[PDB]
Write a protein that binds this ligand. Structure first.
Ligand SMILES: [Zn+2]
Ligand SMILES: [Zn+2]
Lengths: 150, 66, 47, 62
């Protein structure tokens, strides 16, 4: 990956990740994507490694989630909430900030052709058919963090 | 169900007075006194408020369509 | 160009139920759903 | 009346058998509240309006 435009395909926009905040195998949906996280002119494209748990429930638009996200910027890896991610796309410098983070960690750089099998997973995650026994587990997520009377 | 907009017989608007009438009804006014205060003298007009049933208050009890 | 959006009963929330998808709300899983108002034009004379 | 059933003698023993007999007596009765089970059998409260809209029978299991 040597062009700041192409990483935007595997980038999670905020209008769509809320609609995927309850997609099954979420730990298979977000692991590998990139986000425009908020943390003077420094900002970072973070590596989504895993999904962890925070004890703080925050509202992501209409939905609310205590879920945490295991982000990493080359060497700096920790939990984050879906509150500093923005819907806006990656600028030129922020992608280089990510390259510089990968250069400083010694960690292997993604090849340009590798993205094709990752970007397609999101299309199947969006076009997912809700026919199975997902109802108990989907409804359980909202009742866990939001009161029963609404 | 909700206050008729106009007097069935004569055509006088009676839809803009139900809240006024309810304000009058909070006090011990007899159903006739409220009409007297609102100036509705012909019985055609008076029948409109005297016989009205505000059921819409019951209709609001139902869960809302966000 | 519809994913076939339906309105839940007790949730009142638009849920996407595509063809041959079970009519259940995304939240509460209630089985009752109502079709959303038509997008077709609706006009009355008020008479 | 409580049931008293006696097995039909097969006469396999070659003698007039005294076949085993099974007896049943009904005791306590229970009635749940109105319960709606989704197609999966998951129990949920059956509300009259739910039964009305789903053309269900507003009933409770016994
Ligand atoms: Zn009149
Ligand atoms: Zn629902």
């Amino acid at each position: 990956v040597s062009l700041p435009e192409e990483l935007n395909r595997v980038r999670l926009s905020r209008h769509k990740l809320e609609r995927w905040c309850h997609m099954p195998f979420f730990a298979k949906t977000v692991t590998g994507c990139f986000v425009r996280i908020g943390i003077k002119p420094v900002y970072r494209v973070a590596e989504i490694t895993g999904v962890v748990e925070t004890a703080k429930v925050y509202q992501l638009g209409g939905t609310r989630t205590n879920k945490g996200l295991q982000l990493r910027h080359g060497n700096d890896q920790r939990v984050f909430r879906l509150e500093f991610v923005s819907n806006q796309e990656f600028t030129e410098s922020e992608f280089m900030k990510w390259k510089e983070a990968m250069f400083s960690a010694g960690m292997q750089l993604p090849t340009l052709d590798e993205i094709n099998k990752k970007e397609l997973s999101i299309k199947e995650a969006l076009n997912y058919k809700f026919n199975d026994q997902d109802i108990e587990e989907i409804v359980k997520e909202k009742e866990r963090f939001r009161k029963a009377p609404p | 169900m909700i206050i008729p907009v106009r007097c069935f017989t004569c055509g006088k608007i009676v839809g803009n007075k139900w809240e006024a009438y309810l304000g009058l009804l909070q006090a011990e006014y007899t159903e006739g006194d409220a009409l007297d205060a609102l100036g509705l003298k012909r019985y055609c007009c008076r029948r409109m408020l005297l016989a009205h049933v505000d059921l819409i208050e019951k209709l609001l009890n139902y869960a809302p369509l966000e | 160009q519809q994913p076939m959006i339906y309105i839940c009963g007790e949730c009142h929330t638009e849920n996407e139920i595509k063809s041959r998808d079970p009519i259940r709300c995304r939240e509460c899983g209630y089985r009752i759903m109502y079709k959303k108002r038509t997008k077709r034009l609706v006009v009355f004379d008020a008479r | 009346p409580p049931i008293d059933l006696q097995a039909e003698a097969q006469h396999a023993s070659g003698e007039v058998e005294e076949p085993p007999r099974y007896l049943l007596k009904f005791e306590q009765i229970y009635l749940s509240k109105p319960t709606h089970w989704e197609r999966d059998g998951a129990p949920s409260p059956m509300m009259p309006n739910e039964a009305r809209l789903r053309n269900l029978t507003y009933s409770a299991p016994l």
